[PDB]
């Protein structure tokens, strides 16, 4: 109204409120369908006579929990014969934590005599999620993708792993080692079927209490992500794209500078979408937030669903700030 | 250089809005059955019409073109029907398909479907009728809300689009009657909201060679009279749109405006500004803001799993094609 700049501010304020509404609606569907806790009135019957998935520490079978003429599908996690538990408290933590997009949740336990005809004997915990493949099983096929196609797919799975780890670092606990065979992949709920899978962390036997320490401390997982990132990158076909060049520099920075999981997510999101080192940043983020909303509207016109990558992108752009992008760029060009 | 970024953003959302309109229009006009050939096979679906219009009984028929699946409907002449202007029926076969016109795909003579309830050779329409406008009004005006005039104004904009196509042609309809108009669901972009309107009454459409304005819209004084009848059937005039329709009916009979001027003023009541907007100076940033808000609303609906309605496609047609001179006419005709 007689001030083009006030109109520009009102448009940024409303499209950002819409961007948070878009994120919250997609998150509510993406995290929907969670089964309630197990009760004495629930009848448990087996689906899989052989493992539906295998991790490094356990075998997984589906079980149907029937009640009130309906049911939920839960997974029984059966530890492999000879498997150890370096940190038993991490299993007590798994049963104490609320649901998280990238962590394996529990809905209860099947005690002895409650599930007839099982492949195993003894009380078993019930996981809320249903597995499809391990990260190692995905790599066995995925390493045949074109250079940039494979590397992008891995870079987005790494962003999910950093978030799962950020929760744990803010919580006050850490993994002693990273093992892709205990990282499981499933299709995301309510998202396009051709996008990236949802990443679940299951290795709670390796999670231990680790106090955050002083404000100048190193990130407890940084040298594990640096070495793992280089081993995963050595599986990609060669490319000259900035994406692969930034991921190799970030691996050197993870072992050299030792950033936290929240600083790691910032630089990785900045490499995936962010500006170059030349920035100043406000106008860029305001244009990119508006462009994702236009792409979502243009594809909706064709009856196309958003993918998990678009929910993760809209999450970065909605949470991105000038101070956060300053830190993200600083690691990238240093 | 923020001024350079704001110019680039307006151009980037404009090509996206035109792409959204073209993709939703392509879904709405998708599957149009092709012309009838010796390769087509037909089967009867019913013994009673899917729509009963003033001068036609509409029966649904299956067609297959080399095993390509199509549904078409026979326009069986209703007993007592006539043709005051036979040229208008030649015009219906002549013109290209249009979203709000009743299209034809060819003739099916008697004997193709031995079990048919009709006799004689009957042409088959591309669209599949569900009800007439008079049939919708009988129930729809029984328990209207005060905002009911919203559903009527949107069907009126569609009828004005069908009449604008004929007015751009060499043609006019001499007698306008809601009992001869048809409503169907939109294809590919379907919701429970307003139906697609089809203009059917070509038996009464005559030649219109005049150049000078004369009466600019031969259909306007007829729409003004029908709109006053519709406003007395609807809920009390408590919504600004009902008051806008009351003065619009007086203007339709007083000024006899063309369908293109009726669509401008009617779109201004539906989505555009009133006299609160000289006033027209605000239209530049008003279209840029309203165009961006519709793109944002479509993305927020998609985030919730809600498809766009035919109203949202008509809204994006109005906003993508509206200009400062078109909105200047729209507002000047209303006030």
XYZ file of C-alpha atoms in Angstrom:
669
model
C 0.000 0.000 0.000
C 2.020 3.053 -1.341
C 5.270 1.298 -0.144
C 6.548 -1.511 -2.464
C 9.035 -2.585 0.283
C 6.230 -3.105 2.860
C 4.415 -5.267 0.221
C 7.647 -7.274 -0.308
C 7.871 -7.867 3.491
C 4.178 -8.905 3.719
C 4.730 -11.401 0.812
C 7.814 -12.898 2.573
C 5.864 -13.123 5.882
C 2.820 -14.921 4.309
C 4.790 -17.323 2.015
C 6.988 -18.236 5.021
C 3.922 -18.890 7.246
C 2.621 -21.051 4.341
C 6.056 -22.767 4.082
C 5.854 -23.734 7.799
C 2.213 -24.904 7.321
C 3.353 -26.981 4.276
C 6.189 -28.509 6.369
C 3.894 -29.224 9.370
C 1.189 -30.878 7.145
C 3.781 -33.038 5.347
C 5.465 -33.925 8.706
C 2.115 -34.913 10.271
C 1.421 -37.368 7.359
C 5.100 -38.489 7.183
C 5.001 -39.364 10.948
C 1.383 -40.696 10.951
C 0.128 -44.287 11.377
C 2.244 -45.044 14.526
C 0.733 -48.041 16.463
C -0.262 -47.495 20.129
C 1.393 -49.392 23.074
C 0.780 -53.176 23.417
C -1.967 -54.312 25.908
C -3.155 -57.662 27.452
C -6.155 -57.604 25.023
C -3.893 -57.849 21.884
C -3.499 -61.086 19.865
C -0.050 -61.630 18.239
C 0.387 -63.835 15.097
C 3.406 -64.305 12.769
C 3.649 -62.995 9.159
C 7.230 -64.015 8.177
C 8.539 -67.587 8.770
C 11.984 -66.203 7.690
C 13.598 -62.752 8.316
C 11.936 -59.818 6.501
C 15.325 -58.022 7.013
C 18.777 -58.665 8.563
C 21.011 -56.070 10.301
C 24.488 -56.570 11.850
C 23.082 -57.262 15.396
C 19.636 -58.923 14.756
C 17.126 -60.705 12.460
C 13.734 -59.049 11.784
C 10.317 -60.796 11.389
C 6.852 -59.170 10.931
C 4.048 -59.937 13.404
C 0.410 -58.724 13.228
C -1.038 -57.426 16.521
C -4.830 -57.901 16.297
C -7.412 -56.103 18.498
C -10.897 -54.482 18.101
C -11.367 -56.238 14.692
C -8.331 -54.319 13.290
C -4.518 -54.693 13.683
C -1.039 -53.138 13.357
C 2.097 -54.675 11.773
C 5.062 -54.594 14.183
C 8.524 -56.202 13.789
C 10.146 -58.623 16.239
C 13.918 -57.930 16.513
C 15.698 -61.257 17.253
C 19.434 -60.742 18.177
C 21.774 -62.951 16.062
C 23.333 -65.926 17.965
C 26.707 -64.800 19.410
C 25.889 -61.039 19.188
C 27.129 -58.812 22.072
C 25.879 -55.562 23.731
C 28.846 -53.237 24.590
C 26.503 -50.684 26.284
C 23.233 -52.223 27.702
C 21.979 -48.740 28.806
C 21.490 -47.934 25.103
C 18.762 -50.644 24.964
C 17.095 -49.074 28.056
C 17.290 -45.735 26.185
C 15.539 -47.196 23.086
C 12.513 -48.086 25.250
C 12.624 -44.623 27.002
C 12.697 -42.390 23.861
C 9.699 -40.943 21.967
C 9.289 -41.526 18.155
C 11.769 -39.732 15.824
C 11.789 -39.800 11.982
C 15.327 -41.370 11.762
C 15.410 -43.592 14.957
C 13.859 -47.077 15.484
C 10.944 -46.953 18.018
C 9.377 -49.721 20.149
C 5.647 -50.466 20.749
C 6.141 -53.160 23.446
C 7.404 -56.745 23.770
C 6.145 -60.301 22.978
C 6.857 -62.455 26.096
C 7.302 -66.268 26.075
C 4.067 -68.105 25.043
C 2.345 -65.068 23.371
C 3.340 -65.704 19.688
C 2.890 -69.414 18.658
C 4.985 -70.981 15.846
C 7.804 -68.354 15.858
C 11.269 -68.883 14.242
C 12.731 -67.890 17.708
C 12.199 -68.741 21.437
C 12.253 -66.161 24.258
C 10.774 -62.689 24.903
C 11.403 -60.223 21.980
C 10.991 -56.437 21.647
C 8.537 -55.072 19.032
C 9.820 -52.282 16.749
C 7.268 -49.749 15.420
C 8.820 -49.565 11.872
C 8.925 -52.275 9.108
C 12.362 -52.702 7.342
C 13.000 -53.255 3.594
C 16.831 -53.217 3.077
C 20.051 -52.293 4.898
C 22.272 -49.424 3.626
C 24.849 -52.086 2.565
C 22.115 -53.959 0.569
C 21.136 -50.648 -1.095
C 24.829 -49.923 -1.975
C 25.212 -53.421 -3.525
C 22.746 -52.282 -6.275
C 23.037 -48.456 -6.052
C 26.812 -48.302 -6.852
C 25.779 -49.015 -10.529
C 23.970 -45.596 -10.831
C 25.510 -42.720 -12.930
C 28.198 -40.707 -11.029
C 26.098 -37.686 -9.922
C 22.857 -39.746 -9.448
C 24.602 -42.099 -6.954
C 26.434 -39.275 -5.089
C 23.285 -37.108 -4.678
C 21.315 -40.105 -3.332
C 24.107 -40.736 -0.746
C 24.407 -37.021 0.205
C 20.678 -36.908 1.168
C 20.955 -40.174 3.229
C 23.952 -38.586 5.063
C 21.791 -35.547 5.991
C 19.254 -37.953 7.605
C 22.080 -39.704 9.547
C 23.390 -36.326 10.858
C 19.872 -35.454 12.185
C 19.533 -38.841 13.962
C 23.000 -38.122 15.511
C 22.152 -34.453 16.408
C 19.214 -35.667 18.580
C 21.624 -38.053 20.378
C 24.324 -35.352 20.829
C 21.722 -32.907 22.250
C 20.361 -35.810 24.409
C 23.814 -36.627 25.929
C 24.721 -39.984 24.278
C 26.816 -41.211 21.292
C 27.675 -44.273 19.127
C 31.148 -45.800 19.616
C 31.233 -46.913 15.893
C 29.243 -46.379 12.611
C 28.173 -49.688 10.947
C 26.128 -49.432 7.684
C 24.816 -53.010 8.278
C 22.805 -51.650 11.291
C 21.417 -48.678 9.219
C 18.023 -49.702 7.712
C 16.073 -48.111 4.842
C 12.252 -48.094 4.332
C 9.943 -46.133 1.980
C 8.804 -42.769 3.535
C 5.084 -42.437 4.479
C 2.846 -40.218 2.303
C 5.741 -39.123 -0.005
C 6.404 -39.851 -3.729
C 7.500 -43.527 -4.302
C 10.488 -42.607 -6.576
C 12.277 -40.335 -4.001
C 14.931 -41.319 -1.359
C 14.158 -43.878 1.439
C 13.668 -43.044 5.172
C 16.831 -43.865 7.249
C 16.438 -45.747 10.590
C 19.196 -46.176 13.188
C 18.864 -49.526 15.069
C 22.268 -50.107 16.787
C 21.369 -49.120 20.352
C 23.803 -51.697 21.873
C 26.633 -49.220 20.861
C 25.014 -46.026 22.288
C 26.501 -44.783 25.608
C 26.177 -41.708 27.874
C 28.585 -38.974 26.657
C 28.188 -35.530 28.337
C 28.363 -32.649 25.733
C 31.454 -31.035 27.427
C 32.719 -27.378 27.212
C 31.537 -24.873 24.483
C 34.843 -25.347 22.525
C 34.684 -29.216 22.411
C 34.902 -31.360 19.174
C 31.882 -33.210 17.666
C 31.977 -36.803 19.082
C 31.017 -38.412 15.693
C 33.036 -36.147 13.326
C 36.062 -38.487 12.696
C 33.658 -41.480 12.304
C 31.640 -39.518 9.648
C 34.859 -38.306 7.921
C 36.248 -41.872 7.415
C 32.777 -43.317 6.617
C 32.151 -40.461 4.116
C 35.454 -41.243 2.274
C 34.715 -45.004 2.212
C 31.189 -44.278 0.818
C 32.609 -41.771 -1.730
C 35.188 -44.351 -2.969
C 32.139 -46.405 -4.169
C 30.912 -43.629 -6.553
C 31.820 -43.374 -10.269
C 34.149 -40.347 -10.985
C 32.588 -36.890 -11.592
C 33.720 -33.217 -11.823
C 30.498 -31.697 -10.276
C 30.739 -29.323 -7.216
C 28.652 -31.881 -5.229
C 31.382 -34.593 -5.196
C 34.125 -31.948 -4.729
C 32.361 -30.491 -1.623
C 31.793 -33.968 -0.071
C 35.531 -34.850 -0.337
C 36.538 -31.484 1.268
C 33.916 -31.980 4.031
C 35.467 -35.410 4.850
C 38.849 -33.690 5.416
C 37.066 -31.016 7.532
C 35.267 -33.690 9.668
C 38.615 -35.223 10.722
C 40.562 -31.870 10.793
C 38.107 -29.380 12.450
C 35.688 -31.824 14.261
C 32.294 -29.958 13.968
C 29.087 -31.014 15.800
C 26.193 -32.837 14.060
C 24.238 -29.495 13.830
C 27.226 -27.723 12.132
C 27.583 -30.774 9.807
C 23.893 -30.527 8.684
C 24.392 -26.781 7.969
C 27.376 -27.194 5.580
C 25.806 -30.272 3.876
C 22.481 -28.450 3.282
C 24.450 -25.446 1.971
C 26.293 -27.768 -0.488
C 22.988 -29.416 -1.574
C 21.063 -26.085 -2.054
C 23.022 -23.184 -0.559
C 24.689 -20.183 -2.174
C 28.370 -19.883 -3.161
C 31.050 -18.315 -0.882
C 30.576 -14.820 -2.529
C 27.753 -13.809 -0.049
C 23.808 -10.555 1.303
C 22.293 -13.982 2.216
C 18.741 -12.747 3.011
C 17.704 -11.884 -0.551
C 19.011 -15.344 -1.712
C 17.033 -17.353 0.881
C 13.832 -15.287 0.229
C 14.091 -16.028 -3.537
C 14.808 -19.812 -2.941
C 11.924 -20.227 -0.429
C 9.570 -18.669 -3.066
C 10.959 -20.868 -5.908
C 10.358 -24.203 -4.010
C 6.689 -23.149 -3.419
C 6.321 -22.440 -7.187
C 7.897 -25.854 -8.109
C 5.484 -27.599 -5.689
C 2.491 -25.792 -7.296
C 3.739 -26.487 -10.885
C 4.075 -30.282 -10.208
C 0.746 -30.445 -8.251
C -0.907 -29.201 -11.474
C 0.313 -32.472 -13.078
C -1.006 -34.576 -10.133
C 2.613 -35.160 -8.888
C 3.276 -35.738 -5.145
C 6.191 -34.043 -3.256
C 9.081 -36.399 -2.368
C 10.932 -36.816 0.947
C 13.764 -34.696 -0.590
C 11.248 -31.814 -0.955
C 10.127 -32.095 2.681
C 13.807 -32.103 3.778
C 14.521 -29.101 1.423
C 11.535 -27.107 2.746
C 12.750 -27.915 6.286
C 16.273 -26.486 5.521
C 14.878 -23.376 3.795
C 12.316 -22.750 6.600
C 15.004 -23.176 9.369
C 17.860 -21.502 7.396
C 19.095 -18.084 8.713
C 21.987 -15.701 7.802
C 24.035 -16.769 10.897
C 23.361 -20.490 10.112
C 24.324 -20.068 6.429
C 27.440 -18.098 7.507
C 28.612 -21.121 9.564
C 27.649 -23.573 6.751
C 29.669 -21.608 4.132
C 32.652 -21.119 6.504
C 33.322 -24.923 6.555
C 32.800 -25.197 2.759
C 35.420 -22.564 1.692
C 37.378 -22.102 5.013
C 19.641 -4.730 -6.962
C 16.312 -5.743 -5.317
C 14.274 -4.075 -8.118
C 15.926 -6.505 -10.601
C 15.095 -9.530 -8.346
C 11.400 -8.477 -7.966
C 11.010 -8.112 -11.779
C 12.599 -11.582 -12.275
C 10.308 -13.164 -9.597
C 7.108 -11.768 -11.243
C 8.195 -13.230 -14.635
C 9.164 -16.630 -13.036
C 5.736 -17.083 -11.310
C 3.903 -15.876 -14.472
C 5.348 -18.695 -16.692
C 4.623 -21.181 -13.833
C 0.976 -19.975 -13.524
C 0.566 -20.288 -17.352
C 2.129 -23.802 -17.123
C -0.282 -24.692 -14.230
C -3.273 -23.407 -16.290
C -2.101 -25.321 -19.413
C -1.505 -28.584 -17.398
C -4.878 -28.384 -15.547
C -6.637 -27.395 -18.846
C -4.937 -30.411 -20.496
C -6.365 -32.659 -17.684
C -9.851 -31.015 -17.986
C -9.903 -31.391 -21.843
C -8.062 -34.786 -21.815
C -9.547 -37.959 -23.390
C -11.707 -36.035 -25.956
C -13.111 -38.876 -28.199
C -11.869 -38.609 -31.844
C -14.056 -38.496 -35.056
C -16.296 -41.508 -35.936
C -14.842 -44.001 -38.554
C -15.607 -47.626 -39.792
C -13.195 -48.844 -37.023
C -15.665 -47.807 -34.212
C -17.862 -50.344 -32.319
C -20.857 -49.193 -30.165
C -22.826 -50.648 -27.157
C -25.881 -49.170 -25.314
C -25.522 -48.403 -21.539
C -29.127 -47.411 -20.587
C -32.877 -47.257 -21.524
C -33.511 -43.771 -19.944
C -31.685 -40.391 -20.398
C -28.781 -39.317 -18.156
C -30.098 -35.743 -18.737
C -33.547 -34.364 -19.746
C -33.145 -30.867 -21.310
C -35.803 -28.506 -22.785
C -35.529 -29.968 -26.353
C -33.280 -33.104 -25.919
C -33.079 -36.507 -24.134
C -29.482 -37.638 -23.531
C -28.637 -41.400 -23.518
C -25.151 -42.857 -22.674
C -23.368 -45.136 -25.184
C -20.031 -47.038 -25.166
C -17.747 -46.590 -28.205
C -14.525 -48.476 -29.041
C -12.062 -47.352 -31.782
C -9.770 -50.335 -32.608
C -10.220 -51.332 -28.889
C -9.586 -47.702 -27.723
C -12.211 -47.102 -24.953
C -14.583 -44.034 -25.154
C -17.925 -42.950 -23.584
C -20.203 -40.728 -25.765
C -23.873 -39.620 -25.405
C -26.682 -39.563 -28.013
C -28.638 -36.227 -28.205
C -32.102 -37.719 -28.921
C -34.602 -34.962 -30.000
C -37.196 -34.511 -27.186
C -40.900 -34.717 -28.313
C -42.095 -31.169 -29.206
C -38.534 -29.883 -30.017
C -38.006 -27.520 -33.018
C -35.184 -25.681 -34.918
C -35.875 -21.911 -35.495
C -32.334 -21.403 -36.980
C -31.031 -24.585 -38.754
C -27.704 -22.777 -39.459
C -26.940 -22.926 -35.696
C -26.839 -26.764 -35.952
C -24.362 -26.508 -38.902
C -22.322 -24.113 -36.689
C -22.070 -26.732 -33.862
C -20.428 -29.233 -36.288
C -18.220 -26.443 -37.796
C -16.600 -24.955 -34.632
C -13.542 -26.365 -32.774
C -13.894 -27.947 -29.283
C -14.263 -25.379 -26.438
C -14.360 -26.021 -22.688
C -17.930 -24.649 -22.162
C -19.506 -25.773 -25.542
C -21.351 -29.068 -26.340
C -19.021 -30.889 -28.806
C -19.941 -33.536 -31.463
C -17.833 -36.587 -32.562
C -20.116 -37.873 -35.437
C -23.525 -39.502 -36.244
C -24.949 -42.917 -35.155
C -27.949 -43.835 -37.437
C -30.844 -46.037 -36.164
C -29.958 -49.794 -36.120
C -26.366 -49.454 -34.721
C -27.799 -50.280 -31.235
C -30.873 -52.548 -31.902
C -31.955 -52.203 -28.204
C -31.949 -48.342 -28.168
C -35.082 -46.567 -26.720
C -34.918 -43.966 -29.577
C -35.589 -44.131 -33.377
C -33.986 -42.057 -36.188
C -30.348 -40.958 -36.712
C -28.943 -39.156 -33.600
C -25.591 -37.302 -33.327
C -23.284 -38.187 -30.374
C -21.743 -35.501 -28.118
C -18.169 -35.664 -26.743
C -19.364 -34.775 -23.173
C -21.488 -36.993 -20.819
C -24.445 -35.052 -19.205
C -25.310 -35.584 -15.486
C -28.089 -32.941 -14.923
C -29.518 -29.723 -16.413
C -29.045 -26.247 -14.876
C -32.815 -26.033 -14.132
C -32.563 -29.453 -12.327
C -29.593 -28.199 -10.223
C -31.465 -24.942 -9.379
C -34.634 -26.818 -8.192
C -32.662 -28.528 -5.341
C -29.811 -25.988 -5.052
C -32.223 -23.033 -4.403
C -34.349 -25.094 -1.902
C -31.712 -24.850 0.898
C -29.161 -22.198 -0.277
C -26.785 -20.444 2.089
C -26.492 -16.604 1.987
C -23.238 -17.238 0.044
C -25.090 -19.592 -2.436
C -24.832 -16.903 -5.202
C -21.148 -18.003 -5.362
C -22.097 -21.296 -7.059
C -24.498 -19.442 -9.446
C -21.976 -16.682 -10.362
C -19.334 -19.331 -11.288
C -21.774 -21.244 -13.576
C -22.759 -17.839 -15.068
C -19.036 -17.094 -15.878
C -18.855 -20.482 -17.695
C -22.058 -19.694 -19.676
C -20.594 -16.258 -20.524
C -17.427 -18.026 -21.812
C -19.594 -20.268 -24.074
C -21.555 -17.202 -25.326
C -18.306 -15.169 -25.859
C -17.083 -18.002 -28.144
C -20.285 -17.682 -30.261
C -20.112 -13.807 -30.148
C -16.467 -13.974 -31.402
C -17.985 -16.201 -34.133
C -20.729 -14.918 -36.507
C -23.547 -16.081 -34.129
C -26.087 -15.427 -31.320
C -28.722 -17.368 -29.325
C -32.121 -15.604 -29.568
C -33.734 -17.377 -26.534
C -31.792 -18.221 -23.315
C -33.394 -20.959 -21.080
C -31.798 -22.734 -18.033
C -33.805 -25.974 -18.739
C -31.737 -26.485 -21.958
C -28.276 -25.997 -20.275
C -26.200 -29.022 -19.013
C -23.822 -29.634 -16.086
C -21.124 -32.378 -15.887
C -18.210 -33.127 -13.502
C -14.725 -31.837 -14.637
C -12.253 -34.537 -15.872
C -8.773 -35.163 -14.385
C -9.137 -32.251 -11.853
C -12.392 -33.550 -10.211
C -13.669 -32.378 -6.752
C -17.174 -32.151 -5.082
C -17.336 -28.390 -6.046
C -18.939 -26.547 -9.022
C -19.567 -28.617 -12.217
C -18.456 -27.846 -15.799
C -21.234 -26.036 -17.746
C -22.055 -26.935 -21.395
C -23.938 -24.637 -23.834
C -26.148 -26.872 -26.041
C -28.944 -24.781 -27.612
C -27.765 -24.457 -31.252
C -31.262 -25.027 -32.809
C -32.015 -21.361 -31.771
C -28.576 -19.835 -32.725
C -28.770 -17.410 -35.729
C -26.321 -15.594 -38.105
C -24.767 -12.345 -36.659
C -22.783 -10.402 -39.359
C -23.246 -6.814 -37.812
C -19.983 -4.878 -37.192
C -20.913 -1.728 -35.131
C -21.776 -2.174 -31.374
C -25.601 -1.974 -31.935
C -26.618 -4.192 -28.993
C -23.049 -5.403 -27.997
C -24.380 -8.605 -26.297
C -27.655 -9.951 -27.861
C -27.655 -12.362 -24.850
C -27.223 -9.666 -22.109
C -30.905 -8.510 -21.594
C -31.790 -12.237 -21.452
C -29.089 -12.883 -18.788
C -30.263 -9.787 -16.810
C -33.840 -11.173 -16.666
C -32.643 -14.738 -15.808
C -30.192 -13.372 -13.171
C -33.039 -11.458 -11.384
C -35.106 -14.700 -11.369
C -32.058 -16.573 -9.932
C -31.520 -13.869 -7.232
C -35.176 -14.173 -6.042
C -34.760 -18.013 -5.924
C -31.472 -17.737 -3.913
C -30.927 -16.924 -0.199
C -31.296 -13.226 0.987
C -28.907 -10.663 -0.604
C -26.617 -10.234 2.490
C -23.243 -11.068 0.742
C -21.497 -8.336 -1.433
C -21.667 -10.744 -4.437
C -25.525 -10.890 -4.294
C -25.673 -7.055 -4.303
C -23.170 -7.023 -7.233
C -25.402 -9.477 -9.170
C -28.522 -7.298 -8.521
C -26.941 -4.170 -10.146
C -25.303 -6.387 -12.826
C -28.784 -7.613 -13.920
C -29.918 -3.949 -14.364
C -26.721 -3.209 -16.398
C -27.265 -6.356 -18.551
C -30.711 -5.015 -19.583
C -29.736 -1.258 -19.598
C -26.343 -1.312 -21.452
C -26.643 -4.687 -23.376
C -22.856 -5.448 -22.951
C -20.971 -8.235 -24.832
C -20.084 -11.572 -23.127
C -16.395 -10.434 -22.871
C -17.469 -7.346 -20.784
C -19.813 -9.556 -18.676
C -16.919 -11.978 -17.904
C -14.645 -9.078 -16.887
C -17.206 -7.530 -14.469
C -18.326 -11.016 -13.197
C -14.716 -12.141 -12.491
C -14.186 -8.826 -10.618
C -17.153 -9.731 -8.307
C -15.943 -13.376 -7.895
C -12.184 -12.805 -7.141
C -11.414 -9.142 -8.057
C -11.881 -5.809 -6.240
C -15.015 -3.662 -5.745
C -15.234 0.202 -5.649
C -12.851 0.205 -2.607
C -9.799 -0.301 -4.970
C -7.754 7.043 -9.649
C -8.642 3.594 -8.224
C -7.146 1.502 -11.108
C -3.515 2.483 -10.133
C -3.366 -0.436 -7.627
C -4.002 -3.238 -10.239
C -0.296 -3.817 -11.182
C 0.882 -5.049 -7.723
C -2.640 -6.413 -7.018
C -2.385 -9.023 -9.852
C 1.264 -9.867 -8.861
C 0.225 -10.425 -5.212
C -3.042 -12.306 -6.015
C -1.258 -14.556 -8.612
C 1.444 -15.419 -6.031
C -1.249 -16.075 -3.336
C -3.113 -18.561 -5.638
C 0.202 -20.389 -6.352
C 0.830 -20.500 -2.561
C -2.751 -21.795 -1.844
C -2.332 -24.568 -4.472
C 0.984 -25.624 -2.861
C -0.645 -25.558 0.652
C -3.584 -27.706 -0.648
C -1.085 -30.128 -2.184
C 0.764 -30.319 1.147
C -2.611 -31.367 2.677
C -3.472 -33.871 -0.176
C -6.326 -31.651 -1.587
C -6.667 -31.377 -5.409
C -7.509 -27.975 -7.101
C -11.184 -27.453 -8.086
C -12.583 -26.184 -11.422
C -13.006 -22.824 -9.586
C -9.210 -22.818 -8.976
C -8.589 -23.386 -12.728
C -11.128 -20.611 -13.636
C -9.452 -18.354 -10.986
C -5.965 -18.975 -12.551
C -7.441 -18.369 -16.088
C -8.923 -15.010 -14.834
C -5.656 -13.985 -13.025
C -3.202 -15.192 -15.788
C -5.268 -13.372 -18.535
C -6.557 -10.337 -16.514
C -4.892 -6.990 -17.461
C -5.183 -3.358 -16.246
C -7.531 -2.384 -19.152
C -9.680 -5.552 -18.661
C -10.044 -4.809 -14.907
C -10.686 -1.099 -15.718
C -13.709 -2.149 -17.859
C -14.849 -4.725 -15.230
C -14.934 -2.134 -12.411
C -16.342 0.748 -14.600
C -19.325 -1.461 -15.725
C -20.170 -2.442 -12.094
C -19.770 1.144 -10.643
